[PDB]
Amino acid sequence: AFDTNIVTLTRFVMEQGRKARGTGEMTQLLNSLCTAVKAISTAVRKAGIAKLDVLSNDLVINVLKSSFATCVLVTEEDKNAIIVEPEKRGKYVVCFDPLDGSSNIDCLVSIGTIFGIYRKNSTDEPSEKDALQPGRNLVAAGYALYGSATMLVLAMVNGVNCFMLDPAIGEFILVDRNVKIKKKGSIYSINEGYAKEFDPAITEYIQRKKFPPDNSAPYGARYVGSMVADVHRTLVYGGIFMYPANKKSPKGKLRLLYECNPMAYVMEKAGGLATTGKEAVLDIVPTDIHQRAPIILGSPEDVTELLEIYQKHA
Amino acid sequence: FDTNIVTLTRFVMEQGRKARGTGEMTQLLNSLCTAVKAISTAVRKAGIAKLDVLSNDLVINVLKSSFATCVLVTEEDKNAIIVEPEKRGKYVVCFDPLDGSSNIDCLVSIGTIFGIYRKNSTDEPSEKDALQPGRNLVAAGYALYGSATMLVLAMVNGVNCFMLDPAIGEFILVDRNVKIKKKGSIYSINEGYAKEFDPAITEYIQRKKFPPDNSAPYGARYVGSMVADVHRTLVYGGIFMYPANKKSPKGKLRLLYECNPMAYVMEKAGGLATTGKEAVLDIVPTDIHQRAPIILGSPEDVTELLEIYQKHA
Amino acid sequence: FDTNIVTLTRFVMEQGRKARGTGEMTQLLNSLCTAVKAISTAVRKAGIAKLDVLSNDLVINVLKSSFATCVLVTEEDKNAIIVEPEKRGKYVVCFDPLDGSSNIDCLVSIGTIFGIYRKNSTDEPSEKDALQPGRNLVAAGYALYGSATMLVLAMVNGVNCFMLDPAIGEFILVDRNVKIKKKGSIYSINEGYAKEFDPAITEYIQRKKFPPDNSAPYGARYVGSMVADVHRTLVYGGIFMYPANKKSPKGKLRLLYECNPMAYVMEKAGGLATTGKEAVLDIVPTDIHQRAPIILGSPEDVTELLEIYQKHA
Amino acid sequence: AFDTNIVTLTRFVMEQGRKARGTGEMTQLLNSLCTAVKAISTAVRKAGIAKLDVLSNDLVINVLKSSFATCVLVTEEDKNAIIVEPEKRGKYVVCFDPLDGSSNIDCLVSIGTIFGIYRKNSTDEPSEKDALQPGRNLVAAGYALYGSATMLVLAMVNGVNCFMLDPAIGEFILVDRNVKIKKKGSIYSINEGYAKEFDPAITEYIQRKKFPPDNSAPYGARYVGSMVADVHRTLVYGGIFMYPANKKSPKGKLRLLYECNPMAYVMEKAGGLATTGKEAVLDIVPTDIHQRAPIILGSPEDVTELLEIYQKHA
Ligand SMILES: O=P(O)(O)OC[C@H]1O[C@](O)(CO)[C@@H](O)[C@@H]1O
Ligand SMILES: O=P(O)(O)OC[C@H]1O[C@](O)(CO)[C@@H](O)[C@@H]1O
Ligand SMILES: O=P(O)(O)OC[C@H]1O[C@](O)(CO)[C@@H](O)[C@@H]1O
């Protein structure tokens, strides 16, 4: 044991970013983010022995500004975009959900940090307009799951890679390289306590998973109620995850910039699909930083089956 | 930096003192905690570089070494393990060393479940000493390997929750005399089995989604890991169900080391635990690996479901 | 991933079983290990963001809570602590909770030293029960907080060394029945006290540097922390000295909780421990904070120095 | 607790290196080195539960080459300088002692990693000649002490800073900023088992510390027998550390490039002095990568007192 050739997230992003002639900024940005992720992981691991959304928020803003790689930051927590001080500005726009579903801590349900990184393209002064790009423009996106293990999943133009935090050295080690989702899965994930408010396409799809017409075995249902936990299971095991709109949350619950679009970019770089039920989530041009969206994502055939049922109903 | 920390060892030692006992339960839970920490560290790095097997070996070894056990029943072993005379003590332990190990690929929280009986007869230790009603467990609980490692322990005196402090390797008392909510707002079941359900489960699920008294509908959650789902049911209230579907008409979950521990914890917290026909804890087992249907959780929610079972007679 | 790990708790429990005892020594060293891990974590981050005090409070609390002690003697406390009747057990423990705490500024390895006696009288617990010859300790040792945390434990059966595995928070048996080398090649003393030495220490130091039989000279090492210097003397052999200099003419180090533990460990490993006039362990103490001169280490090296003390009469 | 504004070694070197318009290479180099330091720290912390000089060596070479910041590496272990593959070359020369005094592990004596970093100045092809610069040219030097805590001490042109590894997050936190050694100390550190072979200046100096002519209190002696442990005590507490030549190790024992010169640069940036007894260690132009040297270092007045005794004797 004592491996002499550790592949850390920093080393990985460097061996790619160097083959691309990049300015070192991305490595710094993500190395910073990793420091915040280990700090939150440790706090969550001791939380009952020991508001954490708020402390997590502050920590992520402070390591991102000190990376000297960012210029506009968008949080769930902060009402308006944070524009970084000129001395510390670099060229990226980061949109992040710092501690997704923090009420789930009480029940020890695995929660996560979700992030999306854009490059600032304009010549003008950093404003929140720099944050209003469609998901399609993301240069990197991902999440950190704080579970039985801490996994950082990073998607960049070349594919999805998983890194697991080795607790003894405080480093994310590359554990799965260029991940791809199954074509067709066997689990559907949706909160069925909203049955009453679902649209017809949704309702027909669930019945087809439970009562397969085709008289195969019905799908298994799974719903942790933590988006990072449910998307991680959908990525490694396959299947479909659905948070559509239901009358009483008419534009969906999840936020387009820092929950839906990071997950949709990961899904797509893994060979999966992500849609509202009408358009692809990554093509939506955002008009508000806290804009909400329906999302259905997962294995290509499963999503395509629900898209055909949506087509049928309009 | 807190100087009078209550650890699981201090806690169990002071309760045992009141029994005017031998010290054997404290030796036992002390050893079990060593195994729990080692499985926790293993799951935390399961990826960097099967586990159910090592977990099984580890729990058996630390328990044989405690000088507190005489019969051991594992999910992994066809027959009960009888402890060597020189290491025998008075307890029978039935445990599931790493429930739903397949779940580790997806980072789903899993855990160790255990039930401890006292051997009461004078003849040689055997499987029959483990074939007691769950109502006769002297202690039970589970360790959850999740974003934090938690050990929940129920004994005659209540349910207490201990969190592993990873900096000093000790389980610290963080929650005392846990009691479940009387009525919750979450139902937990694998609805992919919908065609396989019976009339009462099906009518109950339906009235959760479409509430007759025009109430708020229940939220649904189903992690797919018994320890995670039951832990949320304990701290948040609600109902968790794994009834008989026709592919598992006795139920899926095993009575001695999955259903009975969890049911003993639920009833100690003021919750209820039923098959839909009898109390889980009052079933008299005939095979150490027999399965049972389970419905457990907040009292009003489980009663409601029991009233749909009997309004269906 | 090793499934039958020998922890200090398993080790002490199986030896105690042979005594047909009460289980009290195991309760005691189990609690002391909880305190040792917490002091270890504290020293490892002493810088990020006094400690002798918290260390002292922590050792007293875990010991009062073990139900195994009745008198406690600390470096930090003017008088012996008598344990409350409801928590009293049979042992007297004298300990130094964080020896040479000033050394932490320089990252010098420091440690906890302890000696355990059995209270033998029938009258109420008092300081007099701690005023026994070191020869009558039933167990002694130290925990070194260094690049690794090590607990060295000596009891009637030998010296064993246990290393803290920081991933599972358990002390693992890594070295069994440690015996010192008969003759070593390192002498350890604070030579800045050179004018204060006596004739025999001065002639001995001189013959280490300029060996009369034209031998190899000894290496000198002096960490300035009793636990580090004595630990190197145990694993590597040699001699360690803190004789009386005229500013400390009784010696500096305290008999009950620094000299006697270390001397009991040395004699159990086959080493010797002297003041230069008597065996340290046979001194009958009159004050719980009295000091003594100490010279301990490999048998041939300590004898040689004893022959320069008597060739000086 | 849970501090939201953690100052890590990476953040520190970045906030300096950015004010200097540097290429990001130094941050990468030292971030790499920190990964190797945490890995060795953890191995040493479990060594008895569990050649490590050799494994440590390999790990340090592999993280340095992957930093894309180095071109020539010099180790105690390897006979000749390691020239890095063109794809991975950057501009620094690193000379390192990977696990100083590894025999001291058996006795749990604190040992360390020592490093010196030069910039390659030549226009020619990386060779070991790039490593043969006098200590005066070092752009950064330092050490990692694996003790009761792991401390990384880093000296750069601006001063000496201490960082302590926080074990829970795997990060070196800045704990002492712009450190300076005491002018005059009260401890002298030398292996006096060599008394017989010392030169007259040394011998006179030790007697003056034990039998102060001036009839003050004699100095205290301390000698751990681990250079990193003894230099760290000399830096924080003051005093003098001496490893001169004694007949049977006639050019000193310690190596000029990766033991003496990193320590001499730290001492001097802390306001201390480091000398052979004849010249300043940092002005010696090395001719062999494994060249040995006398070194006496510590508080300015203490070293100056021994230098005057050396002057007297020639
Ligand atoms: O209770 P609901 O409405 O099903 O919410 C679940 C969703 O809410 C969150 O907890 C926060 O958005 C997500 O992690 C998850 O996908
Ligand atoms: O020390 P003993 O003999 O094992 O007795 C402990 C008994 O006390 C309890 O801890 C509660 O009084 C029980 O769980 C157990 O049966
Ligand atoms: O996939 P299913 O059929 O819903 O079963 C999940 C159940 O099985 C297990 O994975 C193993 O018993 C449990 O942890 C869990 O409650």
Ligand SMILES: O=P(O)(O)OC[C@H]1O[C@](O)(CO)[C@@H](O)[C@@H]1O
């Ligand atoms: O369990 P008890 O009564 O405390 O006895 C333990 C005794 O056994 C030993 O561990 C060795 O036989 C002693 O150190 C101690 O006095």
Ligand SMILES: O=P(O)(O)OC[C@H]1O[C@](O)(CO)[C@@H](O)[C@@H]1O
């Ligand atoms: O500075 P001195 O006088 O050599 O004393 C060092 C001794 O004092 C202590 O620091 C405290 O007793 C010991 O650890 C050590 O052996």
Ligand SMILES: O=P(O)(O)OC[C@H]1O[C@](O)(CO)[C@@H](O)[C@@H]1O
């Ligand atoms: O035994 P000696 O000759 O005093 O050697 C001590 C020196 O050797 C080393 O162990 C290795 O060079 C150093 O850490 C230390 O300064």
